[PDB]
Amino acid sequence: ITNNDDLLIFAKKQILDVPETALTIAYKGKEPVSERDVWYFIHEPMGFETEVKVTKIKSSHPWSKKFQEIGFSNSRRDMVRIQTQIANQVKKASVDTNKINSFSSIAMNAYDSRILTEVVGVVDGD
Amino acid sequence: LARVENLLERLLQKNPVIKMDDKVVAEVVSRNQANSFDQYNYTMGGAAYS
Numbered sequence: 798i799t800n801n802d803d804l805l806i807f808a809k810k811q812i813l814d815v816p817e818t819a820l821t822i823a824y825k826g827k828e829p830v831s832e833r834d835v836w837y838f839i840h841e842p843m844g845f846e847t848e849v850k851v852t853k854i855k856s857s858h859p860w861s862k863k864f865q866e867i868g869f870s871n872s873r874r875d876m877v878r879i880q881t882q883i884a885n886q887v888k889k890a891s892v893d894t895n896k897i898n899s900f901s902s903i904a905m906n907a908y909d910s911r912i913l914t915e916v917v918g919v920v921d922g923d
Numbered sequence: 924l925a926r927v928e929n930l931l932e933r934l935l936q937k938n939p940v941i942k943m944d945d946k947v948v949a950e951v952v953s954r955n956q957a958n959s960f961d962q963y964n965y966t967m968g969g970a971a972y973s
Contacts, residue, residue, distance in 0.1 A: 876956070877956055877959045877960045877963060878963070880960055881960065881963045881964065881967065881971055884964075884971040884972040885967070885970045885971055887972075888970060888971070888972075
């Protein structure tokens with residue numbers, strides 16, 4: 798990009814200026830929770846009175862008697878996510894190097910033909 | 924009943940420490956983490972180690 802407004806919006810998109818929070822709730826009610834519904838969260842000891850949008854669900858079978866785990870505002874850190882990020886970055890770097898190898902080779906390929914043209918012009922000049 | 928008490932005392936002697944192995948725990952943890960990594964890679968197409 799060349800103008801300044803696009804770079805301004807890009808820079809604004811490039812940073813994160815609020816604490817990164819992730820909320821996890823263990824729910825054991827009768828009402829089922831879907832993947833789209835937005836609930837109202839009230840929790841006085843933790844100072845919560847807001848609307849929460851579901852982003853992660855770990856449900857059990859209806860006969861399993863177990864609790865449900867519901868997430869909001871992205872997920873906890875975890876290592877396997879970091880390993881996946883590192884692996885995909887490695888793949889991107891590898892394919893970039895593979896492309897740049899051919900780019901350098903064709904830079905050598907586009908070299909010799911133009912050198913031949915220069916030699917032809919040199920002979921013409923004499 | 925005295926020998927019952929003696930045997931109960933001797934049986935109370937036993938150390939309440941149960942040595943649990945760490946190598947097998949680490950290997951199982953690694954296998955489960957590998958399962959999670961494979962799941963995440965599959966959900967991301969193939970943009971990972973494999």
